[PDB]
Structures are given as C-alpha cells and as structure tokens.
Amino acid sequence: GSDDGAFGDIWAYMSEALTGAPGKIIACGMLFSVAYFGVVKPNLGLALVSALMMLVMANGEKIISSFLD
Ligand SMILES: CCCCCCCCCCCCCCCC(=O)OC[C@H](COP(=O)(O)OC[C@@H](O)CO)OC(=O)CCCCCCCCCCCCCCC
C-alpha cells in the first residue's frame, strides 16, 4: 500500500507510537502487571511472555507493512 495521503500523518504517528512513549507505557504496564500478580503467585514465565509481546510490538510496523503494502 501507500503510507501517504490524507491519513498518512495518523499512520505515521500511530506506527511511531508503537515503539515510542505510548508503546513503552503499555510495555511498562506489562512489567508492573507481572510484578503485581507475582506477589501472591510468583510466575516469571509471564515475564517471558511479556518480553515476547514487546518483541511483537517492536516488529509491529514491519508486520503491518508486509501484509498491507
Ligand atoms: C523475547 C524473549 C524471547 C522469548 C522467550 C520466551 C517466549 C515465551 C514462550 C514460553 C513461555 C513459557 C512460560 C509461559 C507462562 C504462561 O503461563 O503463559 C501463559 C500464556 C497464555 O497462554 P494460552 O493462551 O495458551 O493460555 C491461556 C492461559 O494459560 C492464560 O494464563 O502463554 C503464552 O502466551 C505463551 C505462549 C505463546 C508462545 C508462542 C507465541 C508465538 C505466537 C505469536 C508470534 C507472534 C505473532 C505476532 C502477530 C502480529
């Protein structure tokens, strides 16, 4: 597809926000959630899943651009 047009600025902002502060705030929430839910049930496996989710977020722009040309 085309990255420009009437909605190019919205797409540019949203794609950058995935690895920017809005994406980092969500990623920080995953770590806080893992720590909090580990108080009663310590489960470091969820921390691994959270990291894999951050890896997906880091690759979100590439994944979207590959499917949607
Ligand atoms: C980044 C660091 C390298 C990653 C290292 C670890 C990766 C985690 C795998 C093992 C964790 C084991 C302990 C888990 C602890 C645990 O209990 O996890 C629970 C969590 C939920 O799993 P289920 O939905 O099977 O289980 C439902 C309940 O178990 C919820 O607790 O498991 C996963 O999400 C991990 C499996 C996904 C692993 C395969 C994902 C690949 C598909 C996605 C690929 C990307 C698609 C992108 C689309 C845009």
Side-chain angles (χ1 to χ4, degrees), residues 30-64:
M30 305 159 171
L31 285 198
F32 265 110
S33 168
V34 159
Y36 167 77
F37 285 115
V39 163
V40 161
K41 190 190 118 43
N43 165 198
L44 279 148
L46 284 187
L48 284 164
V49 182
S50 289
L52 179 52
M53 188 75 231
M54 314 178 176
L55 180 66
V56 168
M57 303 179 48
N59 287 273
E61 214 271 8
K62 169 198 216 224
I63 288 156
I64 290 158

